[PDB]
Write a protein that binds this ligand. Structure first.
Ligand SMILES: *[C@@H]1O[C@H](CO)[C@@H](O[C@@H]2O[C@H](CO)[C@@H](O)[C@H](O)[C@H]2NC(C)=O)[C@H](O)[C@H]1NC(C)=O
Lengths: 596, 270
């Protein structure tokens, strides 16, 4: 019996018990998320404890079969997935402490509140007291109060914990034979191509820096335009040749500049493309929304939704007296059970969310044939990218014109294109520098380039340089501003959004070239294109059975992450921005601050 | 010489085959312990089946589904078991996979067809019906019609697990994981007097004339004449030196009839 033979037997037994425990854990999770109760949460925990214990025990045994002696890539990739994790290295005291540190950081973030100076009894929690201020408030001092208060009550409390969190997380990663925690996070993009050298985590860092250098001109012009609009909004507080204050970015952390669209709108006279009123007028409901999504997916040749999907999914909020989690989520419970738990309402936003979530169920109904371990998107970004490409294809004015949701009399002139592209940039281009800078800061903190004695100093220097944003008030090492974000306080990676945007636009350009679409890349619909659907289904079917580089080469023709499709998508926006930035200043100075 | 008449003969059988006791059984066995029922000495009415649109799969190899009611077999074997929806595909000659390696098999020259239909409403519960088992691994692939009923344990890594595994049939599972009841019919070729035949009625014998004859499934055109050849009790057909069927035994009258071509020599039409 070869090592491969024993590996196949072990993996078969693993898939058998794994499909059994996962489905049951997914059933318990569905019951709790659809019926809120102490009894349900008890069941979910029991199902999850059983699944976690089984996964750890199987991961320990999987290390008995060296990946070298393995020949078949499929078996080798399954063994790599099992051997990478499923066995903590921290001591019992350190493991308990890490758990306590993580739980405390989550608790402080959830219960974090900022109380007013004049009235200590009046207090606002992040949801939605503080978030509403950052999202809608235009009072410089009110946003400054909310921003500085959130930092003071949350960052300072998480500062001592986050420092200890880094020490423990890096130690666990070292026990997994990695350089640091950031290196452990980058292991997703590492591949082993058989035709030569493949992809490495250092290659991921090189690619993200090079892609940022390529986006910088478009981002620089968008930053200049937003700076001029903010000078119109907030006088006597913005420097024409300087960075933008952090508390004036329409958000607690300024991850997305979407909330600044009312102030930065290119042409206010031209309206948006909202079809909520037309959806309500024609008597649309959640059933019709998901049926039209199914019609869109079946036009390109993807399979129809299963009857179990229509009979077991929560497409509306229950009214019998059952508390539910209202956050949209596409579910892959296992055993061919695909459902969506979403509070569908009659709006354009819920329509696109239905298409995005159904884009998740369409990638899962393909990799289903793959083994359980390889039932996942090629990388953290490929999946979300697939959903976003679907949303981009269905949101075009032409597609809404076919559905009857958009009046045929609507005319797509240049001003509407500029408005739509600026909104897409605010939600997409305005996020890439923030995500890249935050992940670079976390990587440098984990590696050891930035000691704790310089965490806030570097964080504010990196923010000023990469993002062009300055702190409204000086911050000492008692602050942990990064930890004020949910992803940082709850231990989640962040480069996935960056790679998701890049892969999404690469897929969009590839499928639009296949669909024989001639014209701007932002007016492209892959509907009624069996060739584009065929190549998309070929992309979705492999799952994690092959290197994501090959998958990317198969679909877009190149094996390297490229921001070229992204720049071509925003090319009209780049031209219009360059036209508007002749008299303005492009770039920023990292010396000016609002408090000096 | 066009045939002026058709001669169809069947043995005197009146009992109807008990197909209902198999396709409508209250309990079905697992794949590793599939149940075989021998069918003989009865008339096979296949209209009880094909007419039903319940069957998801009905694939006959070596025989025609539409011509099943016109054929005769020595014995028919009814095998019944329950598998998954995506696994019904492995019930076919020449196919390899978990079913066709350690718990069932059909030979390359298999003659007969498998009937499969969805049984979720009977074999799938909300909490999961775990009364059906399957065998992940056996030491060697199994001869075609072998049954493994032993409860033995096999080794994965350093852990001793059981060869048999629960199927896990849920009512919320996809059709690829839903339970399917599979029933097959194995047809034994004519080496003895036919015992299973269609519901057709025997016709009157016509001798010394070019007619179309159908003796227990043997269809052809020729002139039937009295034969001096003496057939054994287990013999139904006779072959000449050229391996051509020249004599056939009448199933109804137990007599031997010679088969001759309707024309002798080259014939030219002006
Ligand atoms: C999957 O998990 C379920 C958990 O209930 C297992 O179901 C039990 O299986 C044992 C096996 O002998 C039965 O005795 C129990 O009665 C079953 N439970 C119930 C509630 O009926 C099942 O065995 C597991 N399947 C696999 C593949 O291991």
């Amino acid at each position: 019996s070869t090592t491969e033979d024993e590996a196949k037997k072990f993996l078969n037994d693993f898939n058998s018990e794994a499909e059994n425990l996962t489905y049951q854990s997914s059933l318990a999770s569905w019951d709790y998320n659809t019926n809120i109760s102490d009894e349900n949460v008890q069941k979910m925990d029991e199902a999850g404890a059983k699944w976690s214990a089984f996964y750890e025990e199987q991961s320990k045994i999987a290390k008995n079969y060296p990946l070298e002696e393995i020949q078949t890539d499929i078996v080798k990739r399954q063994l790599q997935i099992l051997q990478q994790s499923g066995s903590p290295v921290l001591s019992e005291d350190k493991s308990k402490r890490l758990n306590s540190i993580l739980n405390a950081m989550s608790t402080i973030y959830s219960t974090g509140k900022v109380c007013k100076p004049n009235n200590p009894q009046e207090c606002l929690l992040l949801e939605p007291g503080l978030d509403n201020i950052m999202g809608t408030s235009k009072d410089y001092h009110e946003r400054l109060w909310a921003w500085e208060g959130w930092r003071a009550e949350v960052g300072k409390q998480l500062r001592p914990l986050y420092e200890e969190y880094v020490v423990l997380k890096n130690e666990m990663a070292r026990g997994y034979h990695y350089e640091d925690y950031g290196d452990y996070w980058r292991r997703d993009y590492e591949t082993e191509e058989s035709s030569g050298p493949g992809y490495s985590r250092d290659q991921l860092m090189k690619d993200v820096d090079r892609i940022f250098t390529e986006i910088k001109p478009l981002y620089e012009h968008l930053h200049a335009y937003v700076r001029a609009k903010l000078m119109d909004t907030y006088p006597l507080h913005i420097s024409p040749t300087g960075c933008l204050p952090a508390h004036l970015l329409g958000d607690m952390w300024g991850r997305f500049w979407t909330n600044l669209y009312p102030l930065t709108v290119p042409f206010g006279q031209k309206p948006n493309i909202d079809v909520t009123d037309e959806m309500v007028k024609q008597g649309w409901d959640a059933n019709r929304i998901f049926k039209e999504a199914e019609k869109f997916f079946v036009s390109v040749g993807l399979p129809n939704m299963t009857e179990g999907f229509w009979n077991n999914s929560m497409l509306t909020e229950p009214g019998d007296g059952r508390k539910v989690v209202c956050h949209p989520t596409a579910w892959d419970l296992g055993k061919g059970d695909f459902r969506i738990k979403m509070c569908t309402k009659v709006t354009m936003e819920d329509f696109l969310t239905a298409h995005h979530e159904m884009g998740h169920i369409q990638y899962d109904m393909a990799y289903a044939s793959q083994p359980y371990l390889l039932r996942n998107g090629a990388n953290e970004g490929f999946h979300e990218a697939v959903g976003e490409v679907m949303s981009l294809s269905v949101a075009t004015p032409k597609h809404l014109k076919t559905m009857g949701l958009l009046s045929p009399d609507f005319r797509e002139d240049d001003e509407t294109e500029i408005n739509f592209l600026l909104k897409q940039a605010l939600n997409i281009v305005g996020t890439l520098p923030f995500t890249y800078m935050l992940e670079k800061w976390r990587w440098m903190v984990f590696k050891g380039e930035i000691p704790k004695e310089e965490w806030m100093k570097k964080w504010w220097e990196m923010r000023r340089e990469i993002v062009g944003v300055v702190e409204p008030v000086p911050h000492d090492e008692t602050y942990c501003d990064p930890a004020s974000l949910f992803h940082v306080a709850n231990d989640y990676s962040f480069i996935r959004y960056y790679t998701r945007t890049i892969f999404e636009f690469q897929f969009h350009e590839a499928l639009c070239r296949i669909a024989q679409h001639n014209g701007p890349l932002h007016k492209c619909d892959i509907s009624n294109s069996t060739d584009a659907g065929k190549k998309l289904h070929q992309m979705l079917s492999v799952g994690k059975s092959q290197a994501w580089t090959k998958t990317l080469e198969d679909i877009v023709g190149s094996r390297n992450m490229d921001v070229g499709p992204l720049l071509r998508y925003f090319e009209p926006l780049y031209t219009w921005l360059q036209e508007q930035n002749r008299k303005s200043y492009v770039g920023w100075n990292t010396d000016w601050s609002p408090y000096s | 010489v066009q045939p002026q008449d058709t001669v169809v003969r069947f043995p005197n059988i009146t009992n109807l085959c008990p197909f209902s006791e198999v396709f409508n059984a209250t309990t079905f066995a697992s794949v590793y312990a599939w149940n075989r029922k021998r069918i003989s000495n009865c008339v096979a009415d296949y209209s009880v089946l094909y007419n039903s649109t319940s069957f998801s799969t009905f694939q006959c190899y070596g025989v025609s589904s539409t011509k099943l009611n016109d054929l005769c077999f020595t014995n028919v074997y009814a095998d019944s078991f329950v598998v998954r929806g995506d696994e019904v595909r492995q019930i076919a000659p020449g196919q390899t996979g978990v079913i066709a390696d350690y718990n069932y098999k059909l030979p390359d020259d298999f003659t007969g067809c498998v009937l499969a239909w969805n049984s979720r409403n009977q074999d799938a519960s909300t909490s999961g019906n775990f009364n059906y088992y399957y065998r992940i691994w056996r030491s060697e692939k199994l001869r075609p019609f072998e049954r493994d009923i032993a409860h033995y344990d096999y080794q994965v890594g350093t852990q001793f697990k059981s060869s048999l595994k629960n199927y896990g049939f849920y009512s919320s599972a996809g059709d690829s994981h839903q339970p399917y009841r599979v029933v097959v019919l194995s047809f034994e070729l004519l080496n003895a007097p036919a015992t299973v035949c269609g519901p057709k009625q025997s016709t009157e014998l016509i001798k010394n004339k070019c007619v179309n004859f159908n003796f227990n499934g043997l269809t052809g055109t020729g002139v039937l004449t009295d034969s001096n050849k003496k057939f054994q009790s287990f013999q139904q057909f006779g072959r000449d030196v050229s391996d051509f069927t020249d004599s056939v035994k009448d199933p109804k009258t137990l007599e031997v009839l010679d088969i001759t071509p309707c024309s002798y020599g080259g014939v030219s039409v002006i």
